Amino acid sequence: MELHAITDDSKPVEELARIIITIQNEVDFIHIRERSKSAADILKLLDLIFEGGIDKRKLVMNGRVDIALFSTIHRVQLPSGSFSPKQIRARFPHLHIGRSVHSLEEAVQAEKEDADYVLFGHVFLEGRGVSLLSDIKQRISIPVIAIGGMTPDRLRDVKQAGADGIAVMSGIFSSAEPLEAARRYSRKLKEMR
Template identity: 60%
Template sequence: MRLHVITDDRHSQEELAAKIISIKDIVDFIHIRERSKNVSDISDLISRLLIGGVDKRKLIINDRVDIALFYNIHRVQLPSHSFSVKCVRSRFPHLKIGKSVHSVQEAVQAEKEGADYVLFGHIFETDSKKGRTGRGIGSLADVKAAVHIPVIAIGGITEKRLPEVQTANPDGIAVMSGIISSDCPAEAAARFACYVKGDSYEKAL
């Protein structure tokens, strides 16, 4: 499984950059999902990351295709309210495109339109979607069985829940608060990586 980390839109550019730089060699992908920040703020964040040695190939820009293109970042994540995969694929065929989906039908449609992978959730109830029941492991397994592209699970995934998530055989997991909101993101990321990649804690660090 691949370990994706998603930013939580709760930190300044400086704070967030420091957190991301601390995990850059531990995780597989880092989604920049800062909905309250403007173009200038996100540009400042990306500049800090690149100066700090973050591999551009690990960065995934959520929604803002324009920012990805400006910085020559080749990975984008399209939320449900964003452009269609088909539209982005037709104009920018070089991009790696992920699509956020919430059902088997949406996942199948994303695959038909040319998505490289889907991000499915939320699996469990999470603070970012309080009061909304998670879709569960069964739904994750259904999506995994319905498409041929990678399926990344997201939503309320904690270290304790990883064995349960793995029963659905996702291609990766995405974690937000469990890593980015941690007092020590590197240690939290290393613990997730130990399970996801099967490495020792020391090797992950």
């Protein structure tokens, strides 16, 4: 089960860069989701972590396909209602494409549009999160990453539901000790393995 860290769009680039560098070894991927920052600031953020030695292979750009292309980041997370995977793949075949879905229907269609995996959730949807998680895993063949209120105590349920991984935002980035927070998650996942 993969562990995806999602940036929280609330810290200055310098502070966020340090946290990213600090937690990189406890997670599988880090999604850059600074929706309130300009491309200029996000490029500054990238430059800081690139110079900080981050492994670009773990980076995933949420929404800004342009920033991803000009930053040599080959992974993008497409929000619901934005670019279709098909049009993206037509121009940029090399990109690994994730789609953020919020229903069984959207998940299936995402698979049809050639997405590589879906980020499904805000599991914790009218309380249908965990059940839908199972329903999606049974209907599609691409990976399903669960997001939304993921805590160590809820991982077992998510795992039983068939989730191929979990995504965590505030659980890590709002913690007084981001590294220790990321570790509670990784420890819990390794345990259940």
